[PDB]
Amino acid sequence: LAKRIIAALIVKDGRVVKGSNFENLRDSGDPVELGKFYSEIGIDELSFADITASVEKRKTMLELVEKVAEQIDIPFTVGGGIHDFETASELILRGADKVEINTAAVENPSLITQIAQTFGSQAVVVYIAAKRVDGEFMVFTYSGKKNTGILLRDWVVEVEKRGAGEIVLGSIDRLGTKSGYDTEMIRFVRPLTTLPIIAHGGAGKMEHFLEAFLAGADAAKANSVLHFREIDVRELKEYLKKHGVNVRL
């Protein structure tokens, strides 16, 4: 019933893509050092998205979750190119608390159930990339390239039915725009599912977070606005608690 602030880091070959602005770390491109720092200053969870050349990807993603699990204590999700049960399983066993799946889940919905039966719904996070097309919310796969023809409304329902723990709701429209979260999309989805909704795409200033939590989101995923300190984590939670948002310290 508390809201969460989730720091999201894109990584490739064990490196924070386009790094960060905290000069106070020996390495501002070290995902591990950044992520532990974010944990100290009050990030509620981490989320790593790997985009490594698929040849060294599997080894590289397991290297990362191991390195991370050694140094941090808050939940963290790992995602990106996870296509089957065994890849998710070894990533969780190696340290990750949850995995984030999207395209594999749309093509094979039972993949949500298979991961959940062994690691529990809490470990399965489904990323839903939606966009408005002819007045309807549509689900997109392959990093935005494929309109699946599936309605957001139906996918959200099926994703809970299959046993997902949480849903990351990405507004494609708003991705990388600093214009605010797609609160219209969030309000559309909110009554369709009992699951936690993690809002992604559009953050630019602290009030967007208030707007998003007012819309019904249980958490907020945030990317470059964090790393380039266009928003401070402490000021944000200050702000939201001040205006009645139930955040943790």
Residue numbers in the entry: 2 to 250
How is this structure described in the published paper?
This initial KE07 design (Round 1; R1) catalyzes the cleavage of 5-nitrobenzisoxazole, with 103-fold rate acceleration over the noncatalyzed reaction and a turnover rate (kcat) of 0.018 s−1.
Trp50 in the active site of KE07 is a convenient spectroscopic handle to interrogate the active site environment (a second tryptophan residue, Trp156, is invariant throughout evolution). A Trp50Ala mutation was made in KE07 R1 to assess the contribution of Trp50 to the fluorescence; the crystal structures showed no major changes to the active site nor overall fold. This showed that the overall fluorescence of the R1 Trp50Ala mutant was slightly lower than R1, which is consistent with some quenching of the fluorescence of Trp156 by Trp50, similar to what has been reported previously. The Trp50Ala mutants in R1 and R7-2 result in significant (>95%) reductions in kcat, although the KM of R7-2_Trp50Ala increased sevenfold, whereas the KM of R1_Trp50Ala was unchanged, suggesting more involvement of Trp50 in substrate binding in the evolved configuration C.
